[PDB]
Amino acid sequence: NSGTTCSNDLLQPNTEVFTDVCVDYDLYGITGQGIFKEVSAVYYNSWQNLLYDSNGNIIGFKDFVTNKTYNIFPCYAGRVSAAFHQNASSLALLYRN
Amino acid sequence: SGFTVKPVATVHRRIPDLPDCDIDKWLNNFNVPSPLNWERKIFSNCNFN
Amino acid sequence: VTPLSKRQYLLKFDNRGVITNAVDCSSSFFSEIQCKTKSLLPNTGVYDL
Amino acid sequence: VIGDFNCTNFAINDLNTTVPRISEYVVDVSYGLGTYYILDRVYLNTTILFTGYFPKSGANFRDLSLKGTTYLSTLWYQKPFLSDFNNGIFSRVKNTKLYVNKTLYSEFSTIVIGSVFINNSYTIVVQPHNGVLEITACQYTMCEYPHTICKSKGSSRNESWHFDKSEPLCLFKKNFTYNVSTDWLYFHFYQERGTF
Numbered sequence: 001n002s003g004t005t006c007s008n009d010l011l012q013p014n015t016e017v018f019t020d021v022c023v024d025y026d027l028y029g030i031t032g033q034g035i036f037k038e039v040s041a042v043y044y045n046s047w048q049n050l051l052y053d054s055n056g057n058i059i060g061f062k063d064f065v066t067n068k069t070y071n072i073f074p075c076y077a078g079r080v081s082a083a084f085h086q087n088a089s090s091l092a093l094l095y096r097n
Numbered sequence: 098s099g100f101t102v103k104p105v106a107t108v109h110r111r112i113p114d115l116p117d118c119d120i121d122k123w124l125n126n127f128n129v130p131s132p133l134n135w136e137r138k139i140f141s142n143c144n145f146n
Numbered sequence: 147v148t149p150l151s152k153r154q155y156l157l158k159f160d161n162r163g164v165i166t167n168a169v170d171c172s173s174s175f176f177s178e179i180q181c182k183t184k185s186l187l188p189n190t191g192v193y194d195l
Numbered sequence: 196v197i198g199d200f201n202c203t204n205f206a207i208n209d210l211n212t213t214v215p216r217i218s219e220y221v222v223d224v225s226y227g228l229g230t231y232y233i234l235d236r237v238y239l240n241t242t243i244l245f246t247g248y249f250p251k252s253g254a255n256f257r258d259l260s261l262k263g264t265t266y267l268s269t270l271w272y273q274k275p276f277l278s279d280f281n282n283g284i285f286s287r288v289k290n291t292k293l294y295v296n297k298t299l300y301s302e303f304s305t306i307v308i309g310s311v312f313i314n315n316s317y318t319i320v321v322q323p324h325n326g327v328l329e330i331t332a333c334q335y336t337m338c339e340y341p342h343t344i345c346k347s348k349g350s351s352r353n354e355s356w357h358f359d360k361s362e363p364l365c366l367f368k369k370n371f372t373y374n375v376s377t378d379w380l381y382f383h384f385y386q387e388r389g390t391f
């Protein structure tokens with residue numbers, strides 16, 4: 001129970017990545033949730049793995065296992081408008097935009 | 098209230114600090130020693146599966 | 147060898163990620179103006195240092 | 196005095212014929228020289244403000260290169276050569292080019308950072324090997340007389356700065372490469388909140 005010769009067999013397995021679905025990620029020490037995509041980036045270097053924003057957000061990343069660049073997008077999180085009348089029993093729903 | 102969808106799985110990525118031990122490469126060597134000259138090897142500061 | 151210090155630097159990036167300009171924000175008054183306006187060539191005006 | 200073990204004692208002298216020289220070059224961060232890339236992120240067509248450990252513009256350098264011929268003095272392992280790592284250092288190294296039968300070889304001095312430099316603590320050591328760097332940062336047992344020899348046109352002494360029969364325990368181990376035909380190299384070292 002003391003040393004540095006540990007095994008990554010049961011610690012955390014790597015299986016695959018998912019596309020077009022809001023999923024959680026714990027990439028390179030930073031966590032978040034969102035939807036990934038697939039782009040053709042050429043601005044990555046040997047030591048660069050993330051593409052960051054100018055305000056403190058993540059724009060994309062690159063998986064070193066298969067050498068392809070992605071693009072992380074935030075998924076929908078919004079509210080709905082509901083119109084209601086006193087004499088009525090149901091509601092009128094409106095999803096804006 | 099807002100509509101926040103839940104994630105379906107978890108995706109993690111990390112870069113390993115120490116290299117792999119490569120125990121299988123040493124255990125599959127073609128020069129099999131005799132019990133009279135058994136071989137000994139020390140492994141430390143590496144990762145193995 | 148030269149020492150280091152916790153300072154603030156204005157970094158300019160190109161369309162590929164290569165750093166092209168860096169401003170110390172503490173060398174002269176023009177550097178402070180540039181880092182206050184968050185631009186390499188500030189606009190015409192009167193500022194308080 | 197850096198270590199505590201007695202690794203070797205062949206030629207021990209006591210002379211004071213060295214002094215750090217102040218360089219004539221001035222730090223110019225106009226075009227990027229002196230600044231470092233951020234952690235493994237990418238910025239595109241933006242202008243940012245970063246609060247970090249940087250050198251001061253309009254400053255002078257100091258040399259700490261030591262070279263000898265089988266003779267080592269006790270004053271070489273003390274101040275001002277054994278400087279203090281207050282918050283960080285930025286170093287410029289000259290790529291010494293040698294030729295052995297019309298074959299290019301590159302080698303420069305090595306750096307060792309630590310706290311007490313004993314086996315009970317960690318110690319970072321960076322040294323090149325013919326165009327290949329080596330960063331270990333392991334709990335090495337270094338003696339108070341560390342040195343390093345040249346592989347090309349070797350010296351009388353032998354490279355002996357640590358005495359460890361088995362590899363001690365540590366967290367990091369990795370090799371790096373660089374162009375052997377360059378002339379100047381740059382290095383940045385610092386720490387923050389216990390992270391080096």
Ligand SMILES: *[C@@H]1O[C@H](CO)[C@@H](O[C@@H]2O[C@H](CO)[C@@H](O)[C@H](O)[C@H]2NC(C)=O)[C@H](O)[C@H]1NC(C)=O
Pocket residue numbers: 161240
């Ligand atoms: C880098 O960013 C600048 C600033 O947004 C871009 O300059 C703009 O370019 C568009 C398209 O040509 C023009 O309509 C704007 O008027 C420009 N604004 C300014 C302030 O110049 C520039 O195109 C970007 N470069 C790249 C390669 O995308």
Ligand SMILES: *[C@@H]1O[C@H](CO)[C@@H](O[C@@H]2O[C@H](CO)[C@@H](O)[C@H](O)[C@H]2NC(C)=O)[C@H](O)[C@H]1NC(C)=O
Pocket residue numbers: 116324327328329368369370
């Ligand atoms: C980093 O490079 C050094 C130098 O090439 C490697 O050290 C060599 O290791 C082999 C294998 O044990 C020895 O046969 C050589 O004698 C070593 N050379 C020197 C100069 O020490 C080291 O193994 C490399 N490390 C990694 C992780 O690749």
Ligand SMILES: *[C@@H]1O[C@H](CO)[C@@H](O)[C@H](O)[C@H]1NC(C)=O
Pocket residue numbers: 020021022035075
């Ligand atoms: C939404 O549904 C469409 C239709 O099946 C599908 O193509 C898309 O991937 C879905 N998006 C998410 C985030 O579930």
Ligand SMILES: *[C@@H]1O[C@H](CO)[C@@H](O)[C@H](O)[C@H]1NC(C)=O
Pocket residue numbers: 046064065066067
């Ligand atoms: C990804 O690129 C790096 C650097 O070019 C290379 O070392 C590595 O083998 C590549 N991996 C794959 C799966 O192509």
